[PDB]
Amino acid sequence: CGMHSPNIEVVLVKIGLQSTRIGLKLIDILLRNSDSTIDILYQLGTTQDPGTKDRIQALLKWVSDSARVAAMKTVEYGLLMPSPSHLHCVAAILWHSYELLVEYDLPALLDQELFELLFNWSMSLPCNMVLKKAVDSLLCSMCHVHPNYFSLLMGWMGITPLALTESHLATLASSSQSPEAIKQLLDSGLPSLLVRSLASFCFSHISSSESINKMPITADLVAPILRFLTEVGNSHIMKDWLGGSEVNPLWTALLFLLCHSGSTGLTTQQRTAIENATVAFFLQCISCHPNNQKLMAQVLCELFQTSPQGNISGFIRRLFLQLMLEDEKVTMFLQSPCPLYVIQHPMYGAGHKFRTLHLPVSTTLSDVLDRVITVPVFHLFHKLLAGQPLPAEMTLAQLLTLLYDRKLPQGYRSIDLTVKLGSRVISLLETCPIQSPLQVFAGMGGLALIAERLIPAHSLAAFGLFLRLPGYAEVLLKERKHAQCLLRLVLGVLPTLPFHVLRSLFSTTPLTTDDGVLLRRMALEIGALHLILVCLSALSHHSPRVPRLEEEHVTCLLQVLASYINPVSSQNSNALPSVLLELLSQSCLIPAMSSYLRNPLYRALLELLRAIASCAAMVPLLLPLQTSVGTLLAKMKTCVDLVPDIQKTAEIVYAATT
């Protein structure tokens, strides 16, 4: 069938929707006696005809028979075990029948006994296979159709002591994803009692470790119920509720539990479980939510500010290497009448005509559309935009900023686009991108805080010292991918960038403002000039005056020095202290300059010369300790004789020397 399968499925759909009896018979022989069967069931269930009610009745009768067969324990083989993909397809069919305007009374088909049967089926088997996920997606769709069914489900597990296994909470978290279920769950006291219980357990454990409506939570359920928190954090009002002072004890308690209380006893497997659940929670919280981004930035700055005086624990280290060093991932939803070529939420549809991806923000629309004369061309539209398409090279950060400026609520985890076919004959791109958690954390200088607590190797060692300066990260974040690659090389073009960011920061911070002089005096205090001078001494094989990659390194270091002397070149006399003058009189600048002269890089050296001649307080170092530099430079300029620049720089040096 692999060459003509669309034809077969289409003719099967037409024969099925010809009459009711034939469709019911073929449903029976396709379910009792693959992706294609999922598409067949979808097109049978969601297409509207007078025979739709009997078809969904047959589907419900089949799933009830399978639940019965699983409940007491030839034609019954399909009832001994059902395909979980078929159950997810039935859930999608019921969901799209509830969503679309149907002629029949859909909740009349749903029965409470079906709720009891599928609930007993759910606890009859463990959580490893996907059959539990399928029957739980069916439970979620049916309870979305019937809110009173979920309302009675709360009354079963003692909710208006308690003991819930991991499968119980798994079924509840799976079946709470629908808006009516999550509305009833917020209306129910189960989330409030669980967060109060886990906060009390954390506080009790902290009090026991530091001394060396409430309900006791054991050491096993806490990782699954933290995963419950991760799964419910998709709602934006959930993210706002987690941002209040009522919840903040959860954060502080979990951190004090997982840092101070080392190996009540925490075993390594459960510690890893809580560790991974907290990673998932942190990844879930700040997803497309700038408020959560600044919240985590403030929280991590407060933890790094009160770091003990020196070793960083494994959790905080891996959280730094994980949370803000991977690109932000958003949920992509694609609706299209044309074919576009795992269990997901029923908002995301089914079949190949509904697409759902979990993709990083940094990519553009051309890459996600490639992976999924009048010429038909794909065009992208939004439900909040009327009459204009979307550019192919526009990244998702720009789209997220446009939607957040277009009344889309903050924290909306899944963005939806419709693909249409237009004709081609053979402002939007200029918007600001998303801020991202990494740059938000770097906005208040958290990089210096984490540096204080922490290919040639000397450049990578000097990068950590260089990023301690304020304003370094703001100019560092201009190229995201290469900065992330450099941080990945730090944890354990590439050597040029730690100095190129310093040169650009020197050039963007002039001497006419307070930021430039503060940066220069902090560089004088922390000792960056000594490090770059001994690096130049080691690279040039020359010693200070005691009282192919190397060429690029020397050129870049000379460029850094030139941008340090004159920021405008890339009260000026008293803008720089004489400490730099007495420091440069000791180093190896003069002998290396004399060695290199007597032999881009020449252009950088001439820029350094006009920079060192531009500052009057930096002038008297040019006198050698007896040929002047101006006459020498004129001699080798006549020897060389680009040319107008060389002549202008030589004339400037000659004027400075005279």
Swiss-Prot record:
Subcellular locations according to the entry:
Golgi apparatus, trans-Golgi network membrane; Endosome; Cytoplasm, Cytoskeleton, Spindle pole; Cytoplasm, Cytoskeleton, Microtubule organizing center, Centrosome
Q: Where does the sequence pass through the membrane?
A: none
Q: Which domain of life is it from?
A: Eukaryota
Q: In which tissues is it expressed?
A: Expressed in brain cancer cells.
PTMs per UniProt: Ubiquitinated; mediated by RNF41 E3 ligase and leads to proteasomal degradation, impairing inhibition of apoptosis. Deubiquitinated by USP8/UBPY. Autoubiquitinated; mediated by E1 ubiquitin activating enzyme UBA6.
Function, as annotated: Anti-apoptotic protein known as inhibitor of apoptosis (IAP) which can regulate cell death by controlling caspases and by acting as an E3 ubiquitin-protein ligase. Unlike most IAPs, does not contain a RING domain and it is not a RING-type E3 ligase. Instead acts as a dual E2/E3 enzyme that combines ubiquitin conjugating (E2) and ubiquitin ligase (E3) activities in a single polypeptide. Ubiquitination is mediated by a non-canonical E1 ubiquitin activating enzyme UBA6.
Domain writeup: The BIR domain is essential for its anti-apoptotic function and is important for binding to DIABLO/SMAC and caspases.
Assembly and partners are described as: Homodimer; antiparallel. Interacts with RNF41. Interacts with DIABLO/SMAC, likely with higher affinity to SMAC dimer than SMAC monomer; this interaction blocks the substrate-binding site and inhibits the caspase inhibition activity of BIRC6. Interacts with KIF23/MKLP1, USP8/UBPY, BIRC5/survivin, MAP2K1/MEK1, RAB8A/RAB8, RAB11A/RAB11, PLK1, EXOC3/SEC6 and EXOC4/SEC8.
Question: In which family does this protein belong, per the annotation?
Answer: Belongs to the BIRC6 family.
The name this protein carries in UniProt is Dual E2 ubiquitin-conjugating enzyme/E3 ubiquitin-protein ligase BIRC6
Lineage per the UniProt record: Eukaryota, Metazoa, Chordata, Craniata, Vertebrata
Q: Covered residues of the complete protein?
A: 3371 to 4493 of 4857
